[PDB]
Each structure stands twice: as C-alpha cells, then as structure tokens.
Design a protein around this motif. Sequence first.
Motif, PDB file in Angstrom:
ATOM      1  N   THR B   6     -43.549  98.822 106.504  1.00  0.00           N
ATOM      2  CA  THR B   6     -44.594  97.836 106.300  1.00  0.00           C
ATOM      3  C   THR B   6     -44.286  96.957 105.083  1.00  0.00           C
ATOM      4  O   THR B   6     -44.312  97.418 103.942  1.00  0.00           O
ATOM      5  CB  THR B   6     -45.960  98.515 106.102  1.00  0.00           C
ATOM      6  OG1 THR B   6     -46.311  99.228 107.290  1.00  0.00           O
ATOM      7  CG2 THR B   6     -47.029  97.477 105.791  1.00  0.00           C
ATOM      8  N   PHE B   7     -43.980  95.692 105.331  1.00  0.00           N
ATOM      9  CA  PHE B   7     -43.846  94.725 104.256  1.00  0.00           C
ATOM     10  C   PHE B   7     -45.095  93.852 104.171  1.00  0.00           C
ATOM     11  O   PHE B   7     -45.498  93.210 105.158  1.00  0.00           O
ATOM     12  CB  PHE B   7     -42.643  93.818 104.470  1.00  0.00           C
ATOM     13  CG  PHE B   7     -41.320  94.537 104.460  1.00  0.00           C
ATOM     14  CD1 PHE B   7     -40.846  95.146 105.607  1.00  0.00           C
ATOM     15  CD2 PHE B   7     -40.546  94.583 103.303  1.00  0.00           C
ATOM     16  CE1 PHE B   7     -39.609  95.807 105.607  1.00  0.00           C
ATOM     17  CE2 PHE B   7     -39.324  95.233 103.293  1.00  0.00           C
ATOM     18  CZ  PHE B   7     -38.856  95.848 104.453  1.00  0.00           C
ATOM     19  N   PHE B  43     -43.702 101.751 102.608  1.00  0.00           N
ATOM     20  CA  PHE B  43     -44.591 100.675 102.219  1.00  0.00           C
ATOM     21  C   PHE B  43     -43.911  99.796 101.180  1.00  0.00           C
ATOM     22  O   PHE B  43     -43.426 100.293 100.155  1.00  0.00           O
ATOM     23  CB  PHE B  43     -45.924 101.247 101.695  1.00  0.00           C
ATOM     24  CG  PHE B  43     -46.703 101.979 102.745  1.00  0.00           C
ATOM     25  CD1 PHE B  43     -46.608 103.356 102.868  1.00  0.00           C
ATOM     26  CD2 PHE B  43     -47.502 101.281 103.639  1.00  0.00           C
ATOM     27  CE1 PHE B  43     -47.305 104.025 103.853  1.00  0.00           C
ATOM     28  CE2 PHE B  43     -48.204 101.953 104.626  1.00  0.00           C
ATOM     29  CZ  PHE B  43     -48.107 103.319 104.727  1.00  0.00           C
ATOM     30  N   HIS B  44     -43.853  98.498 101.454  1.00  0.00           N
ATOM     31  CA  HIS B  44     -43.192  97.553 100.558  1.00  0.00           C
ATOM     32  C   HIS B  44     -44.139  96.438 100.210  1.00  0.00           C
ATOM     33  O   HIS B  44     -44.197  95.411 100.889  1.00  0.00           O
ATOM     34  CB  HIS B  44     -41.927  96.991 101.206  1.00  0.00           C
ATOM     35  CG  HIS B  44     -40.997  98.048 101.710  1.00  0.00           C
ATOM     36  ND1 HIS B  44     -41.065  98.549 102.993  1.00  0.00           N
ATOM     37  CD2 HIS B  44     -39.998  98.723 101.094  1.00  0.00           C
ATOM     38  CE1 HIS B  44     -40.140  99.480 103.149  1.00  0.00           C
ATOM     39  NE2 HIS B  44     -39.476  99.601 102.014  1.00  0.00           N
ATOM     40  N   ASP B  45     -44.872  96.632  99.126  1.00  0.00           N
ATOM     41  CA  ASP B  45     -45.928  95.705  98.780  1.00  0.00           C
ATOM     42  C   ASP B  45     -45.457  94.641  97.794  1.00  0.00           C
ATOM     43  O   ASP B  45     -44.349  94.713  97.249  1.00  0.00           O
ATOM     44  CB  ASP B  45     -47.149  96.463  98.242  1.00  0.00           C
ATOM     45  CG  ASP B  45     -46.994  96.874  96.786  1.00  0.00           C
ATOM     46  OD1 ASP B  45     -45.859  96.846  96.271  1.00  0.00           O
ATOM     47  OD2 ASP B  45     -48.010  97.216  96.147  1.00  0.00           O
ATOM     48  N   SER B  46     -46.302  93.647  97.585  1.00  0.00           N
ATOM     49  CA  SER B  46     -45.979  92.544  96.713  1.00  0.00           C
ATOM     50  C   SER B  46     -44.590  92.000  97.005  1.00  0.00           C
ATOM     51  O   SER B  46     -43.864  91.665  96.091  1.00  0.00           O
ATOM     52  CB  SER B  46     -46.106  92.974  95.247  1.00  0.00           C
ATOM     53  OG  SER B  46     -47.478  93.138  94.919  1.00  0.00           O
ATOM     54  N   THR B  47     -44.236  91.901  98.285  1.00  0.00           N
ATOM     55  CA  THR B  47     -42.960  91.294  98.693  1.00  0.00           C
ATOM     56  C   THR B  47     -43.047  89.776  98.708  1.00  0.00           C
ATOM     57  O   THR B  47     -43.900  89.217  99.389  1.00  0.00           O
ATOM     58  CB  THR B  47     -42.587  91.740 100.123  1.00  0.00           C
ATOM     59  OG1 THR B  47     -42.467  93.166 100.162  1.00  0.00           O
ATOM     60  CG2 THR B  47     -41.278  91.072 100.597  1.00  0.00           C
ATOM     61  N   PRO B  48     -42.159  89.089  97.961  1.00  0.00           N
ATOM     62  CA  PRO B  48     -42.191  87.638  98.055  1.00  0.00           C
ATOM     63  C   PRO B  48     -41.798  87.188  99.457  1.00  0.00           C
ATOM     64  O   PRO B  48     -40.693  87.524  99.936  1.00  0.00           O
ATOM     65  CB  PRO B  48     -41.134  87.185  97.037  1.00  0.00           C
ATOM     66  CG  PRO B  48     -40.972  88.361  96.099  1.00  0.00           C
ATOM     67  CD  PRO B  48     -41.177  89.568  96.977  1.00  0.00           C
ATOM     68  N   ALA B  59     -47.721  89.524 106.492  1.00  0.00           N
ATOM     69  CA  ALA B  59     -47.185  90.861 106.692  1.00  0.00           C
ATOM     70  C   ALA B  59     -46.117  90.885 107.771  1.00  0.00           C
ATOM     71  O   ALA B  59     -46.197  90.155 108.756  1.00  0.00           O
ATOM     72  CB  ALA B  59     -48.285  91.813 107.069  1.00  0.00           C
ATOM     73  N   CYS B  60     -45.117  91.733 107.572  1.00  0.00           N
ATOM     74  CA  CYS B  60     -44.150  92.006 108.622  1.00  0.00           C
ATOM     75  C   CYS B  60     -44.008  93.510 108.776  1.00  0.00           C
ATOM     76  O   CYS B  60     -43.633  94.218 107.838  1.00  0.00           O
ATOM     77  CB  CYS B  60     -42.802  91.359 108.299  1.00  0.00           C
ATOM     78  SG  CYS B  60     -41.625  91.567 109.633  1.00  0.00           S
ATOM     79  N   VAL B  61     -44.354  94.008 109.958  1.00  0.00           N
ATOM     80  CA  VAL B  61     -44.239  95.421 110.222  1.00  0.00           C
ATOM     81  C   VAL B  61     -43.090  95.638 111.214  1.00  0.00           C
ATOM     82  O   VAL B  61     -43.024  94.973 112.259  1.00  0.00           O
ATOM     83  CB  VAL B  61     -45.571  96.014 110.748  1.00  0.00           C
ATOM     84  CG1 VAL B  61     -45.393  97.459 111.113  1.00  0.00           C
ATOM     85  CG2 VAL B  61     -46.699  95.862 109.703  1.00  0.00           C
TER      86      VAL B  61
ATOM     87  N   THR C  47     -39.628 104.172  96.517  1.00  0.00           N
ATOM     88  CA  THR C  47     -40.351 103.565  97.646  1.00  0.00           C
ATOM     89  C   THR C  47     -41.558 104.399  98.045  1.00  0.00           C
ATOM     90  O   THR C  47     -41.416 105.578  98.352  1.00  0.00           O
ATOM     91  CB  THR C  47     -39.433 103.476  98.885  1.00  0.00           C
ATOM     92  OG1 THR C  47     -38.287 102.678  98.572  1.00  0.00           O
ATOM     93  CG2 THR C  47     -40.185 102.893 100.101  1.00  0.00           C
ATOM     94  N   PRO C  48     -42.763 103.795  98.052  1.00  0.00           N
ATOM     95  CA  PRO C  48     -43.897 104.574  98.524  1.00  0.00           C
ATOM     96  C   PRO C  48     -43.733 104.909 100.001  1.00  0.00           C
ATOM     97  O   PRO C  48     -43.594 103.991 100.840  1.00  0.00           O
ATOM     98  CB  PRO C  48     -45.094 103.634  98.322  1.00  0.00           C
ATOM     99  CG  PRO C  48     -44.626 102.628  97.293  1.00  0.00           C
ATOM    100  CD  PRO C  48     -43.157 102.459  97.579  1.00  0.00           C
ATOM    101  N   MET C  49     -43.751 106.202 100.314  1.00  0.00           N
ATOM    102  CA  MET C  49     -43.531 106.675 101.684  1.00  0.00           C
ATOM    103  C   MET C  49     -44.540 107.758 102.089  1.00  0.00           C
ATOM    104  O   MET C  49     -45.271 108.305 101.255  1.00  0.00           O
ATOM    105  CB  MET C  49     -42.087 107.178 101.847  1.00  0.00           C
ATOM    106  CG  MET C  49     -41.044 106.136 101.454  1.00  0.00           C
ATOM    107  SD  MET C  49     -39.294 106.614 101.351  1.00  0.00           S
ATOM    108  CE  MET C  49     -38.938 107.049 103.056  1.00  0.00           C
TER     109      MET C  49
END
Lengths: 113, 113, 113
Positions: B6-7, B43-48, B59-61, C47-49
């Motif tokens: 999850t980005f 989980f990949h948050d705060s992705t530019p 979001a890109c899942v 990485t949060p997983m």
Amino acid sequence: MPVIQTFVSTPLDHHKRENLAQVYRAVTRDVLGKPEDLVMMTFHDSTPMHFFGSTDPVACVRVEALGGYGPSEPEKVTSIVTAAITKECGIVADRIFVLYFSPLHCGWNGTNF
Amino acid sequence: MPVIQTFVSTPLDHHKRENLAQVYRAVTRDVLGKPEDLVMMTFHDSTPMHFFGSTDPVACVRVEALGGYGPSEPEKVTSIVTAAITKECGIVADRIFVLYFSPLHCGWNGTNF
Amino acid sequence: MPVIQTFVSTPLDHHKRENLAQVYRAVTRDVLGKPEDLVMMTFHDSTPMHFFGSTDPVACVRVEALGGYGPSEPEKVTSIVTAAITKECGIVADRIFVLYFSPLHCGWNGTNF
C-alpha cells in the motif's frame, strides 16, 4: 493507466520531482499514446542501493502498463527516462535500470479495466 | 500467500494501518478464499506522488498472488480496497489505483510453493 | 540484469546492507549464473508491515529477472536469501517471503536488452 515508480539513491527535491513528472507525462502521451493525466508516479528518493560494487548514485525505474507495449515503445521510454534521470539527478546512464511489466488487472475509481 | 503493498501520499498512523490490515485480512479470506494470516502487507506512507496533474492525496495498491485470480475476484478486491482507503485515508476513489500481478514463484519459510 | 528489492520491518545498518549485498552478489553468480556486478539491489528498512496477525519482524524480498529462472534456481535462491535474512536481521524463516517475477523488458545504459 500506466504506473511509474522511480527509485533513486540520491535525494529528490520539489524541482527534480516536478521535472521528472513532466518528463513522464510527456512520454506517456507521446510514446505510449495515453493520456498524461492517467500516469500515476511515485518517487522514492535516498533509497539505499548497491550496484556494480558500490552505493554510488544509481536509479531503478519501474514501468507498469496494462496490455503491455508496442514494438518500439520500450526502447524510446528507456532512452528518454535515462537521459532525464541523468539530467535531473546527475546519475550516470550505466547506473540506471528501467524495468517494464504489465499487470493482469488494474482498478481505478473503484472499478477494473 | 498474497502480498499487498500500500502506497499512499498521506501519513498513516497506527489506527489506519491496523484498520487497513484488517480490511486486507478480510478480503483475503472472503474474496480470495485464502487464510488471512498468510497475506503479507507493507505500508508506505507519505510517498511523494504525482497523478492527474497534482500531488494531492493519492494511493496505489499492488496485489500479488501466485496462481492469479478467479474471474470475479479482482473487481471485488478493487471495490473493497478503494472504499477502505477512502474511509481510512480520505483519499478520493478517482485518485486510487489497484494493480494486480502474479509472481512466477513464491518462497516462505525457506521453501517455494 | 536481475533486480532484488529487500523490504524488512527492522532497521538495516551499514553492516547488514553490505552483508546482504554480498550474499546477493554471490547467489547471482553461483545460482543464477550471472555477473554479480549486474544485480541492482535496493534496501527498504523499517517498513511498517503486518503478517500472520502481527507487526513483528518480517521480510519480503522481491526478485526480478528478465527471461525467468532455471528449474532449480528459485528453490536455491529462496533457501540462501532466507537464511541470510535470518542471519543478518534476526527475522525468523516463517516470517520471510521471497517473490519471483520477470519483467517483459529491461533497460540499462539507455538501451534495452
């Protein structure tokens, strides 16, 4: 609806991300023949990487497009993306990979295409 | 053994990551027909990111499942994941992609399946 | 020109990244039969997983190789990578996934192969 993920080992600032996004918008429209508004782009800067025996500036760009690619499209994309990453980031061409995939399915706006 | 990455361009906190993980556990079991304990989620948050001309919440899942998908499964997954990302993150549906792939091989516990 | 992306939920330091890179260089040459200088490796630590009901130390390694894999190669890679991640990171084998893909095309040095 292509996706382009950009990993670089160097920092990206506003200026570089905007410049790259505009490069990717252009190649989506001009080479891929798709609307530039529909390319989703992610930027992953300062990524710890290792390649050809070192951690020196290096890039890996991933391209995902449903339905694959026309016969001359990947070579063009690779040429343009490489030069653009070299331009904006100062990363040398022989430290830039561009990988091409195509997903089985893609959802946008709650629905699959 | 599916993988779901999850980005999102927004921050994720404990609450959102837990809520999303429970959504993904449910869809793995109920739609994918697989044990919910065997979905690995990142989980990949705060992705530019950049999409449709802006860096606004997006979001890109990515979904990866060995052996691909049943005929109605991707549409269901896309519907549930989109609504859940809209619920938890406030990201609008027309700024949410869900891509589906299937790897050639998968290893877990030192062995391939 | 394989790509190996390493996601772990734990922190990676210089020591672990170097040790893993050397493991991946070795398996590229010895198992994959390819030059070790041509594996591009990215490291994504902390990485949060979520997996098997918890956020406890867990790893997901992705392997991408143009032209796919020989019949016994993925099992070997999975065996070596798993043990190495367990060694360096302390992550248990039953919390380690290794996924294998193959892209359609790959660019390096501005040109496709």
